[PDB]
Amino acid sequence: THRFVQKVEEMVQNHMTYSLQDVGGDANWQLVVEEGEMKVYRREVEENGIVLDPLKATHAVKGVTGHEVCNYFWNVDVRNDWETTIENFHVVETLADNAIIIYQTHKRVWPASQRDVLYLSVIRKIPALTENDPETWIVCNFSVDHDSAPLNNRCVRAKINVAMICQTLVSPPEGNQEISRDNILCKITYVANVNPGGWAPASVLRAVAKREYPKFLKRFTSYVQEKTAGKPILF
């Protein structure tokens, strides 16, 4: 259907295989911030003195479904309502109704150069592995090469591999009666592997990650709750 179908499959399947694992029991992940059910972990990793620190967070959001969370995360039309670190954004290519390529710039983090990013953003539903397991909605955003990448001399090109992975638990329907948002919970695993693509001071990037990832998860999840309240559920 498009030239990135196989790459998309590999990237999604890699998150399904490796990103969903629990890390509460795993001393190799450092728990850096906890705010209720929001648990943010990282590993301290540098390659050539540049911070790569894999980030992984879990959260549990009442009253929204994974399909809703993923749609709001993927939909570029609502990006401005919840993003706080983007300066500019351009849709570079549409590949499918569920997959686009995006160019964006982030606000400068002093004293490093501003960063830009060029990535494929795809939204997929993954069927239950067995009839015991939940279905998964996943958004994966991962860097790719493209010819219609802008010249932007202020920016160093970062590379990313991010996934927002959601499983939704509900009270079953009681005969002919809908499920209430009161009885729905969206379990989130969010992972972010960012390569700043060049020099940046490690302590500054680590301090920024520690602040901004929790702020993002809080703001974004609250936004989804706020926008879906009193609207019919989209499972």
Ligand X SMILES: O=S(=O)(CCO)c1ccc(-c2ccc(C3CCCC3)c([C@H]3C[C@H]3c3ccccn3)c2)cc1
Is position 220 an interface residue for ligand X (rule: CB under 6 A)? no
Kindly write out the interface string for residues 69-98 of this chain, putting x where it contacts ligand X by CB under 6 A and - elsewhere.
----------------x-------------
Does residue 76 contact residue 89 with C-beta atoms inside 8 Å?
Answer: yes
Beta-sheet strands, E only, within the chain: 30-35, 38-42, 46-47, 50-51, 55-62, 86-96, 99-106, 114-126, 136-143, 155-157, 159-170, 184-195
Residue 24 φ then ψ, to 5°: -55, -35
| Closest CB 173 distance from ligand X, rounded Å | 33
| Closest CB 172 distance from ligand X, rounded Å | 33
Sign of CA dihedral 54, 122, 158, 86: negative
Nearest residue (CB) to ligand X, 122 versus 184: 122
Which listed residue (20, 52, 160, 233) binds ligand X by CB under 6 A? 160
Which listed residue (7, 106, 157, 227) binds ligand X by CB under 6 A? 106
From the list 6-14, 26-34, 112-120, 178-186, the region that binds ligand X by CB under 6 A is 112-120
Count interface residues toward ligand X (CB under 6 A). Answer: 19
Q: Which residues pair with 194 in a beta bridge?
A: 160
SS3 193: strand
Separation CA 214–CA 198 (nearest Å): 24
Which listed residue (99, 196, 214, 217) binds ligand X by CB under 6 A? 196
Separation CA 69–CA 85 (nearest Å): 20
Is position 216 an interface residue for ligand X (rule: CB under 6 A)? yes
Binding interface with ligand X (CB under 6 A): 85, 106, 109, 112, 115, 117, 141, 158, 160, 162, 192, 194, 196, 200, 208-209, 212-213, 216
